[PDB]
Design a protein around this ligand. Structure first.
Ligand SMILES: Nc1ncnc2c1ncn2[C@@H]1O[C@H](COP(=O)(O)OP(=O)(O)OP(=O)(O)O)[C@@H](O)[C@H]1O
Ligand SMILES: Nc1ncnc2c1ncn2[C@@H]1O[C@H](COP(=O)(O)OP(=O)(O)OP(=O)(O)O)[C@@H](O)[C@H]1O
Ligand SMILES: Cn1c(=O)c2c(ncn2C)n(C)c1=O
Ligand SMILES: [Ca+2]
Ligand SMILES: [Zn+2]
Ligand SMILES: [Zn+2]
Lengths: 521, 146, 48
């Protein structure tokens, strides 16, 4: 049977479960030709890793696979939206369908094209000049040869601001229909497993969501449409079964839900990845006004390649300590001021000519300003822009006022502040390292690491491409979905009923078949 | 070799052969090997310090052109920042090499009319492009060596 | 380094103990070995 084994190598799943009188087991089940296809593809694989990164970071060992199947409920969503786009007034439809559909497939290159326009509107703009007499103040262009560039900036600005307005269109058709899914099925759980709005009370994101439950279309895109009738029963008899049914409320424009639009704009306008792509536009209008504003678009190089993001992410995340230090270097520069203002005012004289004395320190709102603008930027302490105390009457006292500056506020403090940052950078990235491991040695379905399947050859590439393969459990979860429910076999029900009750105990948690069958195998 | 022919032509080209001290003792190779291997991040940073020095230029070019006057004599004003292909060149040649930010080769805003606004244009340079960035770039390297 | 110390405490608690000896390579086999064996059995607040 060699050829039929090798014809069905990629289509034969294999999944180990736990239960049915406390043992382990092997389940065998058919993989389709299309779930194997649209999981190998990059827009999705991505997410995988993603999930992998953070849940190895801030997950314990308890709540981990409450997050897993919270994730496998998502990738089986937009997988169902990837096929949503793959290839007189009625023909508006076919255009409207075709246009945005085949648009949003294009998307990621539609943006990267935006960037490369910004690397021309700046360079081409890096030629200006001003002068007293035009070709008052007059601004023209230089371009001493090639006298058609100065026109090109008019067809490289009406071709950018267009490409901004696409991405706003592309986003609102490819990505938001997840970011209300992942809200609605975050609410309905917390309204039917511990009843937020019905026996406890609200976090503003809670309070904002009262606006929807009245509406007649609450499960708009999260599968279900019964949750309502599910919580007029569970938490519904003790409370007024007429009282709750109030709380829920038990062409296009002629019947558009007046409420629930205002909600749906609620969570998008608060979502960062959208709320950026407005700023990225509304500058690009302002360009036309002043035409240097297309310099701002150049800042996208931080939200780009991995290292560059870390650059800025680093600068922020330790901001707890950092701002609270600079809130101290602005203080211990005060104290010197009060000392300077009282005793050493005679020296702070920047007057190069004796006819007009200048006396930087009389008004302490200046002498505090003078110290923090040329006394931390001179790298030689404050005694670098002052007369010197060679002469007399305070010299000794003065030469300890300085060399205590130098030490504190230019050797300790400015060392700290470069420090925090640079090493914080280093540490975000070491984390990226520990994930990289944790995977390799141990696990991520069972418990054990690799001191057990090290004894046999290739214990890794068997026990993570044969037995505990973290990708089979999304094929199961969506092979289960569509078997006609009256022929779930002997294991394939007891999972499926242990699933709609959320008990997450059909996950091995430290065993393999080679785990109790060590003696028999 | 082919340098060592060119020597005969100009005779200083036998200075180039002196560079072999990098492909020599173990530590010295690591010196240069280090400098490269992290080049993924490194070049992609210096490709940012050449940008956030641009932004200041655009700000300087529009509002504070009056100060960028290196003319030691009032008969021949010099005005380093008129053509933005210069004021972008002036910043990245004496405004990251002076260790005191850009407000070290300029008139000072004691007098008026922008002083406050001007003294935050500078001390935001100093911080970003001489305390964060130039710290990063020594950093990458030295610790990569380590 | 003062602050990395603040880090090692943060751990030492999580893995091991602070009444008995053992760490968590023993109550790892069963589900939720932590939140049983430190809110049920060896709970460092019961002994007050
Ligand atoms: N316990 C585990 N469960 C599941 N997968 C594991 C486990 N241990 C290692 N692996 C796998 O080692 C794999 C190596 O990566 P893989 O080639 O399969 O795709 P990838 O992670 O996205 O990286 P790449 O795209 O370059 O291939 C990891 O993806 C991971 O799936
Ligand atoms: N061996 C142990 N004995 C007692 N407690 C333990 C042990 N291991 C972990 N813990 C507990 O994990 C707990 C997590 O903190 P906990 O929520 O209970 O209060 P906390 O330490 O003061 O922090 P927080 O106020 O934010 O809640 C620790 O307080 C600690 O009591
Ligand atoms: C559990 N489950 C899902 O989690 C799911 C679904 N259709 C989509 N979702 C996401 N079906 C039909 C389902 O039984
Ligand atoms: Ca049956
Ligand atoms: Zn495993
Ligand atoms: Zn204990």
């Amino acid at each position: 049977a060699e050829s039929i084994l090798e014809y069905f190598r990629p289509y034969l799943g294999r999944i180990e479960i736990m239960g049915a009188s406390r043992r382990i087991e092997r389940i065998y089940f058919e993989i389709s030709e299309t779930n194997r296809a649209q999981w190998e593809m990059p827009q999705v694989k991505e997410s995988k890793r993603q999930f992998i990164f953070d849940v190895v970071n801030e997950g314990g060992e308890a709540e981990k696979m409450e997050l897993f199947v919270s994730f496998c409920e998502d990738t089986i969503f937009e997988m169902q939206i990837a096929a949503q786009i793959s290839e007189f007034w009625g023909e508006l439809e076919v255009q409207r369908v075709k246009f945005l559909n085949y648009l949003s497939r294009n998307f990621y290159t539609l943006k990267y094209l935006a960037l490369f326009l910004a690397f021309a509107i700046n360079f081409i703009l890096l030629f200006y000049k001003v002068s007293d007499s035009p070709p008052n103040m007059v601004y023209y262009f230089l371009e001493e040869s090639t006298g058609y560039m100065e026109p090109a900036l008019w067809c490289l600005s009406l071709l950018h601001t267009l490409v901004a307005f696409l991405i706003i269109i592309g986003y609102n058709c490819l990505k938001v229909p997840l970011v209300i899914f992942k809200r609605e099925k975050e609410l309905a759980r917390k309204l039917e497993f511990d009843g937020l709005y019905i026996t406890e009370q609200p976090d503003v994101k809670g309070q904002w969501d009262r606006l929807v439950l009245n509406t007649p279309s609450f499960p708009s895109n999260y599968w279900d449409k019964f949750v309502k009738r599910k919580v007029l029963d569970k938490h519904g008899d003790i409370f007024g079964r007429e009282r709750i049914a109030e709380l829920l409320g038990m062409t296009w424009l002629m019947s558009i839900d007046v409420k629930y639009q205002i909600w749906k704009f609620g969570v998008i306008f608060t979502d960062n990845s959208f709320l950026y792509s407005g700023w990225y536009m509304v500058m690009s209008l302002l360009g036309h006004y002043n035409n240097f504003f297309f310099a701002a678009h150049l800042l996208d190089i931080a939200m780009g390649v991995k290292t560059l993001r870390t650059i800025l992410s680093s600068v922020t995340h330790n901001g707890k300590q950092l701002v609270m230090t600079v809130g101290l270097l602005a203080v211990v520069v005060y104290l010197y001021t009060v000392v300077a203002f009282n005793f050493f005012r005679k020296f702070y004289n920047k007057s190069e000519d004796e006819d007009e004395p200048d006396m930087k320190c009389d008004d302490m709102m200046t002498c505090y300003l003078f110290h923090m603008y040329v006394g931390v930027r001179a790298g030689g302490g404050i005694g670098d822009e002052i007369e010197d105390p060679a002469g007399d009457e305070y010299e000794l006292y003065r030469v300890v006022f300085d060399i205590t500056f130098f030490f504190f506020v230019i050797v300790i403090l400015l060392a700290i502040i470069q420090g925090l940052i640079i090493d914080a950078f280093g540490e975000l990235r070491d984390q990226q390292e520990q994930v990289k491991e944790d995977m390799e040695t141990k696990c991520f379905i069972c418990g054990i690491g690799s001191d057990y399947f090290d004894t046999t050859p290739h214990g890794f590439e068997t026990h993570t491409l044969e037995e505990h393969n973290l990708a089979n459990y999304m094929f199961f979860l969506m092979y289960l979905i569509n078997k006609d429910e009256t022929e779930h076999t002997g294991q394939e029900s007891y999972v499926w009923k242990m699933y709609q009750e959320r008990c997450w105990d059909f996950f091995p948690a430290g065993d393999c078949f080679r785990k109790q069958y060590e003696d028999q195998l």
